[PDB]
Scaffold this active site. Structure first.
Site, PDB file in Angstrom:
ATOM      1  N   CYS A   1      -2.744   1.590  -3.192  1.00 18.10           N
ATOM      2  CA  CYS A   1      -1.606   0.979  -3.866  1.00 18.10           C
ATOM      3  C   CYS A   1      -1.404   1.335  -5.316  1.00 18.10           C
ATOM      4  O   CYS A   1      -0.278   1.604  -5.739  1.00 18.10           O
ATOM      5  CB  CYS A   1      -1.653  -0.530  -3.712  1.00 18.10           C
ATOM      6  SG  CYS A   1      -2.965  -1.416  -4.559  1.00 18.10           S
TER       7      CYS A   1
ATOM      8  N   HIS B   1      -3.551  -5.842  -5.946  1.00 19.90           N
ATOM      9  CA  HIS B   1      -2.354  -5.130  -5.445  1.00 19.90           C
ATOM     10  C   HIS B   1      -1.427  -5.008  -6.633  1.00 19.90           C
ATOM     11  O   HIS B   1      -1.478  -5.861  -7.523  1.00 19.90           O
ATOM     12  CB  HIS B   1      -1.691  -5.853  -4.265  1.00 19.90           C
ATOM     13  CG  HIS B   1      -0.605  -5.074  -3.587  1.00 19.90           C
ATOM     14  ND1 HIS B   1      -0.699  -3.708  -3.325  1.00 19.90           N
ATOM     15  CD2 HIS B   1       0.561  -5.476  -3.045  1.00 19.90           C
ATOM     16  CE1 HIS B   1       0.416  -3.311  -2.704  1.00 19.90           C
ATOM     17  NE2 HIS B   1       1.198  -4.363  -2.537  1.00 19.90           N
TER      18      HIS B   1
ATOM     19  N   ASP C   1       7.750  -1.393  -3.170  1.00 16.94           N
ATOM     20  CA  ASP C   1       6.331  -1.264  -2.863  1.00 16.94           C
ATOM     21  C   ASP C   1       6.131  -0.218  -1.790  1.00 16.94           C
ATOM     22  O   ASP C   1       6.427  -0.480  -0.630  1.00 16.94           O
ATOM     23  CB  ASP C   1       5.768  -2.655  -2.423  1.00 16.94           C
ATOM     24  CG  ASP C   1       4.339  -2.613  -1.962  1.00 16.94           C
ATOM     25  OD1 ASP C   1       3.615  -1.612  -2.244  1.00 16.94           O
ATOM     26  OD2 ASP C   1       3.854  -3.664  -1.458  1.00 16.94           O
TER      27      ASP C   1
END
Length: 276
Positions: free
Chosen positions: A71, A111, A128
């Site tokens: 991420c 995250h 995202d």
């Protein structure tokens, strides 16, 4: 002292030209990124921390070397690219709650996601491309309440306080993915977080192998020996016999260049985490 290689990134994700910084562009870049740069944690699996979230570092690995990332690397890269194009980008951090038991302890901020203001559009957009197999495949309005359509399944944001929760409607069932606040985070805070996810011995990304990619028609998610593919009308599950077949999938299905990890014995490490 250099200049951001916007063309090399566009090339990596199958695009060309130079687009307007508008909403259509944001959708196009997200879809192209989704199918082009895979989610992967080979570095932390092999003992290589993910420590540097600079534009130089992220471009070197995800653009110049035919590697994917996790991420912080995905959203880090896309954040730089979007700013270069004229979008305004804040980096946010989040706690993953996907499938976590009910009174499970508070998770770490592990995250990183983006909150993007688009010229010519009201509010901001949650972007995202870094969550893996179930990552968002469209930008959505950063607006709590409404069910929003994407290229794939519906997603929804809800708010309790400054805490936002993103959920996905997965095969009919709403599933919470992660919570976040809208506080912009400096790079150094993200780097501390990535140090943790990439080095703590309890981390999901240090204890096993995760590889993913998302095309128009399918979500691909590999954890250890188990490959799951979600398509319209059906799910496929491929259970690989050994690390040899897992490595073949990394290289050949997911398009990751293991030549870049020459000297580390990737197969032997993969052989240890087939079932973790």
């Amino acid at each position: 002292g250099m200049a951001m290689d916007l063309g090399g990134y566009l090339t990596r994700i199958g695009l060309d030209g130079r687009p307007r910084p508008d909403l259509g562009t944001l959708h196009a870049i997200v879809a192209a990124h989704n199918r082009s740069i895979p989610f992967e944690n080979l570095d932390p699996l092999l003992g290589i921390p993910v420590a540097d979230l600079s534009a130089e570092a992220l471009f070197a690995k995800l653009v110049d070397r035919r590697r994917g990332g996790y991420c912080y690397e995905h959203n880090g890269l896309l954040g730089y690219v979007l700013e270069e194009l004229g979008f305004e980008v804040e980096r946010l951090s989040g706690r993953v709650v996907w499938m976590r038991a009910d009174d499970a302890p508070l998770p770490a901020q592990t995250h990183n996601v983006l909150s993007v203001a688009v010229p010519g559009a009201d509010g901001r957009y949650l972007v995202d491309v870094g969550f893996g197999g179930q990552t968002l495949t469209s930008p959505i309005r950063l607006e709590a309440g409404p069910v929003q359509q994407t290229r794939h399944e519906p997603y929804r944001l809800t708010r309790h306080g400054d805490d936002h929760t993103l959920a996905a409607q997965v095969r009919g069932e709403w599933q919470p993915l992660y919570t976040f606040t809208t506080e912009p985070r400096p790079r150094i805070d993200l780097e501390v977080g990535s140090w943790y996810v990439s080095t703590h011995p309890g981390s999901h990304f240090v204890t096993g192998l995760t590889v993913a990619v998302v095309t128009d028609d399918a979500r691909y998610n590999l954890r250890g020996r188990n490959l799951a593919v979600h398509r319209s009308g059906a799910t496929e599950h491929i259970r690989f016999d050994s690390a040899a077949q897992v490595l073949d999938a990394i290289v050949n299905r997911f398009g990751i260049d293991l030549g870049d990890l020459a000297g580390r014995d990737v197969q032997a490490r993969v052989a240890e985490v087939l079932d973790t």
